[PDB]
């Protein structure tokens, strides 16, 4: 038996840590199909902003045009989504890129020889030798000048080495950065790894006090099993600490006295980010997509 | 291909959404079938798998020159001991979860780091379709050629397969 | 060629840690194990992207056909 008011009693969240980049939390007493649905939407459905069309005016470097375009699209941009809307690819290119859809970035680099005396390091030897991702300059086309004036568009990781040059060579491009989801292409995925692990369970069956208690410590990570003496003998302190190495089953001394299993409802999510959004906010955005993924079907005519 | 003669075609590009993930959160780049290995007998791939994984963890690179290991000094017990020092499974296995259903898999999956290759000949220029097109002027039969929209040959042996089925209208 | 922007398997941005990693090994005189762990790389899918990179662009940039000699 199941109820939507019995789910509210038993479901608990324990947030272990939180950061501007990663977030470790728990989901007690939820289903493996619900927890997998939250995992997928964070990877494949929560939208992000990435460079989709790259317009080269000149590229006299070594890195090919279709390679250097691909490296720009993989740069994580610190645009907050829902400041953009979605593009519409059924209407032509002169109608398609309004400033509500598109963020325009550009790059203009020319490498020259530097007069310097000494093998020597190539940043003390040329000018604009290494092209970093912070050289993507934000061009506020239109009304973006006043609404992106509190938060300018800049990569979340500015020291991404995009290219390298030598004197004579140049890169002169301009990219159009558009909103999309990560099931289209892996560049629009907001997250480094949004993934859960299931809670380990260490079931002791017989007491292992004594010399057994000392090496059964070393079959687990160094904070999992606790020992005092024969008094307060052997138990789990933190099963969440345990990596499931199955290192105790390879010893015939302990291959009977423990059953390694899992708690099948306690999930341990590790959500990270590329840097556009915070990982507690790509989880609210993920739990609301699955909600709206079913409002759209409830409010829909059952055709045929 | 790997460096052991385990080549094979890319049969499908498979999304991360429904590709199995680990305790660590690692979707593998390459899934290889375990039914490749019993008849090919590339157990150098089973020890390259658990020695690349140990080397990517500890940051070291390992020697794979032949006749360095003995029968008393098996590499499954050498590189496997380097996985147990990190905090992994000794046997190269690793707990995986299903990317489709979401439940954990039945046993632990043998995952590691193997060096792969990409063969130069590709299927970009192999095939042809033809509905109708140019002919040969002596025979009024479709021309030969992959570029010029040429026909498929139904030769002497393919003719006899159509007499064998008894179908006189597929031969016609 | 140049260091890839993102890791192939997880998706961490890794392209900003190649010039950091070479200065960790040259000046701090660390080993490759600690220098990867200082840079926040701790999944072995994501370790090998910096660990096992060749960086052949330095050999390609020696052939500049725009500059004399």
């Amino acid at each position: 038996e199941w109820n939507v008011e019995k789910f509210k009693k038993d479901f608990e969240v324990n947030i272990s840590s939180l950061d501007a980049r990663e977030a470790n939390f728990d989901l007690i007493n939820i289903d493996t199909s619900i927890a997998n649905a939250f995992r997928r939407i964070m990877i494949s459905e929560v939208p992000s902003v990435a460079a989709e069309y790259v317009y080269f005016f000149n590229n006299t470097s070594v890195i090919q045009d279709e390679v250097l375009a691909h490296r720009i699209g993989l740069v994580p941009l610190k645009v907050d989504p829902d400041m953009l809307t979605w593009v519409d690819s059924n209407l032509p290119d002169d109608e398609k890129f309004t400033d509500e859809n598109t963020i325009v970035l550009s790059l203009n680099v020319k490498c020259t020889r530097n007069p310097d005396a000494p093998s020597t390091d190539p940043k003390e030897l040329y000018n604009n030798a290494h092209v970093y991702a912070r050289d993507l300059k934000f061009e506020p086309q239109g009304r973006q000048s006043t609404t992106f004036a509190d938060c300018p568009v800049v990569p979340a990781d500015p020291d991404i080495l995009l290219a390298k040059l030598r004197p004579g060579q140049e890169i002169s491009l301009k990219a159009h950065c558009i909103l999309g989801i990560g099931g289209d292409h892996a560049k629009f995925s907001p997250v480094s790894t949004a993934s859960y692990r299931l809670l380990p369970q260490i079931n002791i069956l017989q007491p292992i006090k004594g010399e057994s208690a000392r090496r059964f410590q070393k079959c687990f990570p160094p904070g999992v099993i606790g020992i005092d003496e024969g008094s307060d003998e052997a138990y789990v302190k933190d099963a969440r600490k345990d990596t499931v190495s199955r290192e105790v089953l390879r010893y015939e001394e302990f291959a009977d006295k423990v059953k390694l299993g899992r708690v099948r409802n306690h999930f341990i999510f590790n959500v990270e980010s590329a840097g556009a959004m915070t990982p507690e906010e790509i989880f609210f955005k993920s739990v609301r997509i699955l909600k709206n993924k079913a409002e759209y079907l409830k409010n829909c005519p059952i055709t045929q | 291909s790997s460096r052991h003669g385990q080549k094979g075609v890319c049969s499908r590009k498979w999304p991360t959404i429904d590709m199995p993930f680990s305790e660590t959160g690692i979707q593998p780049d390459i899934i290889i079938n375990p039914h490749a290995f019993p008849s090919r007998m590339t157990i150098g791939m089973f020890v390259e798998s658990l020695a690349g994984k140990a080397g990517a963890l500890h940051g070291i690179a390992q020697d794979s020159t032949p006749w360095i290991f003995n029968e008393d000094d098996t590499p499954a017990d050498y590189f496997g001991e380097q996985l147990a020092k990190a905090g992994y499974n000794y046997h190269g296995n690793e707990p995986m979860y299903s990317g489709a259903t979401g439940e954990e898999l039945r046993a632990d999956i043998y995952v590691g780091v193997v060096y792969y290759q990409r063969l130069r000949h590709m299927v970009n220029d192999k095939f042809q379709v033809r509905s109708t097109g140019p002919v040969n002027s002596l025979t009024m039969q479709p021309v030969k050629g992959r570029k010029r929209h040429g026909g498929i040959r139904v030769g002497e042996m393919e003719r006899d397969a159509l007499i064998g089925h008894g179908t006189s209208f597929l031969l016609q | 060629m140049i260091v890839p922007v993102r890791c192939f398997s997880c998706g961490k941005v890794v392209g900003d840690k190649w010039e950091s990693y070479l200065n960790l090994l040259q000046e701090d005189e660390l080993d490759e194990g600690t220098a990867l762990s200082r840079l926040g790389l701790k999944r072995y899918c994501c370790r090998r992207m910096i660990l096992t990179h060749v960086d052949l662009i330095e050999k390609f940039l020696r052939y500049n056909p725009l500059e004399k000699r």
Partner: peptide, 24 residues
Amino acid sequence: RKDVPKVEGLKLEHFATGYDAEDF
């Protein structure tokens, strides 16, 4: 015949999701 040498200083570098060097 010489063994294949045990590489020395090889300590733990696999921690669970959200753990760090909290093991001394």
